[PDB]
Amino acid sequence: LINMRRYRNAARKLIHHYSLNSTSSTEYKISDVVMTMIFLLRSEKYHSLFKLLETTFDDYTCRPQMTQVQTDTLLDAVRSLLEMTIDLTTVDIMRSSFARCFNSPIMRYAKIVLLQNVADKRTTLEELLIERGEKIQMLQPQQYINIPFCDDAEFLNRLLKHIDPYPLSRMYYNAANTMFYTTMENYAVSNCKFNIEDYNNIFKVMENIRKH
């Protein structure tokens, strides 16, 4: 007999991280993986997800064939587990993350990785720039634009009072990690090499900008 609630909570947290649906950085151990897999097996309506993630043990065995109703039901199951949008690419992210976690060896220090192996056309940033580029100009714009900056002291005072208890550092961390994860997921989904040199050089540019 196992505690359904604890296993469900561990599964929820680990899947939240492994789906890139949350920025909560909590050190995850092998025990959380064991709990999430056991809960996935035990719960009847998560059997599809459990089989999906268990197929990742061998790299040569790929995703089971699911008819549209099955995919929709699994999407509803994932949504219920996360109580949050969620779609097929989230499932692909989860599959890749769990595959890399499972095939990884037992080790003393947490391994830091980047999203990869999701979604034939291995491209770079410039070809995507050109290509998607036109697909953009192809579309006609929706709106045509052809500005109040009020400094109402009382109103800004009330806004500051509302914002004052918020730990600015936490807000910056959340925003930056959200932008980073969205950029990484867009790169991986588009099958484009994510050049972290450029992304880190963005921060380096900000740092060099400040001190002048």
Binding site: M84, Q142, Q143, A176
Partner: protein, 254 residues
């Protein structure tokens, strides 16, 4: 207030005197206070929220970006954010570029991986691209709102002695503001140095330091992303795949 200093040597009665103006030291001390910089950043964010409010934009940003049908609100929000950032850089122009067009993207097939807001010239007018699903995915992501990022003594001493804006909403506002700030830096290089330099910058952000510090570093205020030093966890290990036996003689970006 001024402070005077006198130096006297043992060979004579001569005294050489200098006057220091305390305002410089007070300014440094004020700039060294954590609460002062926190107030500056929070006041910028509050001004942004007030600017949205006077434009009826009171609905949460996530709800604004989740509405596929109503494009006018998305265009107005992005334009207002761009104008706010432009005024922050140049506190003399209240109206942004008087004419520009907006196109909203709902497909991955025509999406740019990492630059959700992009600018282009259709030979007649500025055009701005908005990747709506990317911004929706950004704002809808769950935030870490219980963890603490690193004074207990003052709290101990104290113990012994109306628009509803949640933390999630404020984080969403800051996220959109930073995204539009990045877009505006790209747009500034565009407008001031040509399409060629803009598309060069899209693939190499390192040109920002040279094309901003020449004018912006001595004339405008501080940038929002410069409030904290951001680094990628275990950056060296992940970057080990691309290592050069280098010889850097033009290391213009430390």
């Amino acid at each position: 207030n001024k402070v005077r200093t006198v130096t006297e040597i043992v060979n004579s009665d001569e005294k050489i005197q200098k006057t220091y103006e305390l305002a410089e030291f007070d300014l440094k001390n004020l700039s060294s206070l954590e609460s002062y910089e926190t107030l500056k950043i929070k006041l910028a964010l509050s001004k942004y929220m007030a600017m949205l409010s006077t434009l009826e934009m009171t609905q949460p940003l996530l709800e604004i970006f989740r509405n596929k049908a109503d494009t006018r609100q998305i265009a107005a929000v992005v334009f207002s954010t761009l104008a706010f950032i432009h005024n922050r850089f140049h506190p003399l122009v209240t109206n942004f570029t008087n004419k520009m067009e907006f196109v909203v993207t709902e497909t991955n097939d025509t999406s740019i991986p990492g630059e959700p807001i992009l600018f282009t010239e259709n030979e007649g007018v500025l055009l701005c691209s908005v990747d709506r699903p990317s911004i929706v995915k950004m704002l809808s992501r769950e935030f870490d709102t219980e963890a603490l990022v690193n004074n207990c003594n003052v709290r101990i001493a104290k113990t012994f002695g109306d628009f509803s804006i949640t933390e999630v909403e404020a984080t969403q506002y800051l996220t959109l503001l930073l995204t539009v700030e990045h877009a505006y830096l790209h747009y500034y290089i565009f407008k001031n140095y040509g399409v060629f330099e803009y598309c060069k910058s899209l693939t190499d952000h390192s040109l920002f330091t040279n094309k901003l510090r020449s004018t912006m570093s001595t004339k405008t205020s501080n940038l929002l992303l410069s409030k904290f030093k951001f680094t990628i966890e275990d950056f060296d290990k992940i970057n080990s795949n691309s290592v050069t036996s280098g010889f850097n003689i033009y290391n213009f970006n430390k």
